[PDB]
């Protein structure tokens, strides 16, 4: 089936960001036998390695905004994998490193499919521009440089020149949000972008949120879905071993529920699976929690089901 | 009253699964003062006593079916004395235990009540057949034994020609579901058992749940429940010393939800609590968090309300 | 500032009505974790009233089992007092205790300038056993019956309580989070009517629909000052364990705050008590400021902090 043909691009990346050890997520979600579990429910996998950022040492800031060479670059970089992964018919599964890589990520995917709708799973928002932004980290940014609503209001940052905003505000849903920046949240509200904050979820319910979800994106006509998981929309009491935990998140069965009714629809198109930092839990332990959840939510993007999952075949028979 | 009449059978058994301490499952229970809790809740209680399970020498597995005839003798002893307890007009309260002893205790039941129903809250279907199954654990089959559309798929298996199928596929409710195997989810599937996986509880809520449950089980008229407690159908934070846990399951609330919602029925009629071991407890805490969940589960089933109780006498005079 | 985000803090450093000690030192922790300034981060007008001096009472005699009611009356105869003059002044009155026997106090007070308020309590206890119900005695599980008009001749008259008028009716309370309510204080909640969730109908519901029927039966009809008392035993003890009676099995941090958000949003929030957190109580020093960082979410929520966003009415995209 189509919706389980995979393409994985490894994006050990962490220059979006400034904790170091987000780059060997790709390593760590190898090493949890990803591939090997996916092959199991009867996907047909190819691996296209772990692209070679090559170093951009000289890389002063624009104004506070750390790293926008090597950012850019590396999202320049996914953009045209992601492109060559969507043009071979499959799925791209983008391994990362920190969420800067979206801005790639989806500029890939629109590239071969511009009917694509987002949605975004994370506690943030990651819609700062490179001049409200506080931090002046490139992970907190992604959204603003994908919006065409927001032109006219992106500085030419370097590193970025081939970025055209590819989504229209009416096409992203967030689900998770708990931590938006005032900047963020006029942004939000002004641009009318769907979203359900951790406040919707526990209005609704997430039965209700995906059902308003896939109805928000595909009620107008069916078209390529694109998920962006940012491991940090989960509870950190499931994913800990990330840069910027929020307590009060999605819960384990929230993010399998999420995921599984995205692979129903038969539409999803591209998965990004970012944050995982093997670096930054508070035990071993933790760290395993952390890529064990990452990849429970990747297996059911790709049919894992919790009701059970069958060939067809007579298993009464065989 | 009859929904708080209450016949208790200790199952110590442990052959139907490969992981040693679930045997202690009733010790444990009673050592929580399960039965001193359950008369200060107005419950009229008999202890039947625990039951005891000889040993078979020679028990040779049945293809790759383990202890086959120890298995299906004591589901052959506990139906005997479940259908003791429901002739004496009370609800059989089984102490496990592993979930292979839910044979005799549906089929002692059964027995009694032929029309019952069953909810089985579990993080697993317990439908392999004894071709199906790939580990050869009995706790994985029970319900392949019970139900009535595969007779003529079980296979003469040593220790169980006494079983009769007794519930028919439409009889069933399935709750918590979330680590199904495939031969499994074809038999849920075919059957057109109903079922309430973990999907559909984060889905629908647990209120939805148990309305579409009951309704379902009773829509026609009144009709005696039975309820097979896994207490792995709780998620591990919750129940940790079980053998199969699988994170992602049910909470604390929503356990004493499902059991406070059948007790409004004054239906209950069959309650088995299984799978509790003692041994598989990280920490002595882990053992006693696992053990207070399994006794707040059974005061729920037998009228403990979270609103609160009190009793027909005015309390300000 | 907004009428919803204009605030006078009220310590009250009492212990008392229950028998664990440390719960006097819950305004100190509370203050220590920047609770007044980052109320200031969120656009809030704070006036910080003080903590209210307790005086020792050493001729103490129990009233039949019913311990310290003369300490216990007359704190909560302070409170009133000093609840009525922040109410007066035109501000949300925020009580940080404090055990919650002071709840007589802070909604007597309240009740003196606005009699028609109604009163949401969170708590894992309904709190309403009377002087003759009661079985340990502490009137930490009492303050309900002494406001209830319902009850007027079932409350013996205890000693340092006289100043107490009944100011709500069973009609204007809603009970949210129960899950360990004795025998005679659930014939009280039965015969009175009152209306309530306890884990059984938030489970069933969902906390959106919990809070859609709060706000609907107290407000409905018409308007009305709100006054939110918060046992921080409500939520389960994974989130705020520093506390003398934890009940398993509570409300989650996101109930926690889905409930403060929806009763900032009415913008009829009038008085609020954070009680029970008791720094003495933690296992570990994690588990104390687990309590301490969960209690200070639950006020700034009730002030205006939105897990979505806050923003001023300011363009931030050309400013
Ligand atoms: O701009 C920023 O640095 C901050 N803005 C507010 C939320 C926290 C943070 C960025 C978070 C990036 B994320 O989601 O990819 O982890
Ligand atoms: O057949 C088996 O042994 C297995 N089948 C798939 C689920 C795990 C296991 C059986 C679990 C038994 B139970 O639910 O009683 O704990
Ligand atoms: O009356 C009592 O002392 C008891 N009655 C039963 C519940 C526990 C307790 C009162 C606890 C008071 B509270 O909510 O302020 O912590
Ligand atoms: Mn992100
Ligand atoms: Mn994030
Ligand atoms: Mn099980
Ligand atoms: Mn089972
Ligand atoms: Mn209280
Ligand atoms: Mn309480």
Redesign the interface.
Do not use: C, F, Q
């Given at each position: 089936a189509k919706s389980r043909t995979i393409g994985i691009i490894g994006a050990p990346f962490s220059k979006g960001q400034p904790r170091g050890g987000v780059e060997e997520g790709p390593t760590v979600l190898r090493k949890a036998g990803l591939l090997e579990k996916l092959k199991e429910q009867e996907c047909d996998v190819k691996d296209y390695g772990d692209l070679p950022f090559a170093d951009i040492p000289n890389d002063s800031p624009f104004q506070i905004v750390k790293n926008p060479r090597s950012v850019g670059k590396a999202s320049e970089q996914l953009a045209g994998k992601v492109a060559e992964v969507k043009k071979n018919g499959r799925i791209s599964l983008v391994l990362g490193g920190d969420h800067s890589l979206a801005i790639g990520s989806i500029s890939g995917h629109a590239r071969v499919h511009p009917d694509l709708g987002v949605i975004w799973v994370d506690a943030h928002?990651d819609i700062n521009?490179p001049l409200?932004t506080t931090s002046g980290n490139l992970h907190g940014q992604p959204v603003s440089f994908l919006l065409k609503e927001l032109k006219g209001?992106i500085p030419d940052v370097p590193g970025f020149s081939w970025v055209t905003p590819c989504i229209s505000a009416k096409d992203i849903v967030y689900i998770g949000?708990?931590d938006?920046?005032?900047?963020?949240?006029?942004?939000?509200?002004?641009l009318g972008i769907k979203?359900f904050?951790?406040?919707?979820?526990?209005?609704?319910?997430?039965?209700k949120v995906?059902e308003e979800t896939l109805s928000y994106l595909l009620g107008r006509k069916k078209r390529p879905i694109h998920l962006s998981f940012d491991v940090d929309g989960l509870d950190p009491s499931f994913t800990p071993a990330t840069g910027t935990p929020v307590?009060?998140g999605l819960?384990?069965?929230?993010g399998?529920?999420i995921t599984?009714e995205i692979y129903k629809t038969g539409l999803l198109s591209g998965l990004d699976i970012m944050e995982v930092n093997p670096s930054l839990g508070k035990t071993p332990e933790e760290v395993t929690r952390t890529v064990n959840t990452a990849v429970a939510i990747t297996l059911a993007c790709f049919g894992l089901?919790?009701?059970?999952?069958?060939?067809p075949i007579?298993?009464?028979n065989p």
């Open positions: 928002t521009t409200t209001k949000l708990r938006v920046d005032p900047g963020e949240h006029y942004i939000l509200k002004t979203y904050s951790m406040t919707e979820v526990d209005r609704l319910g997430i039965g995906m307590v009060g819960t384990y069965r929230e399998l529920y599984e089901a919790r009701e059970g999952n069958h060939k007579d298993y009464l």
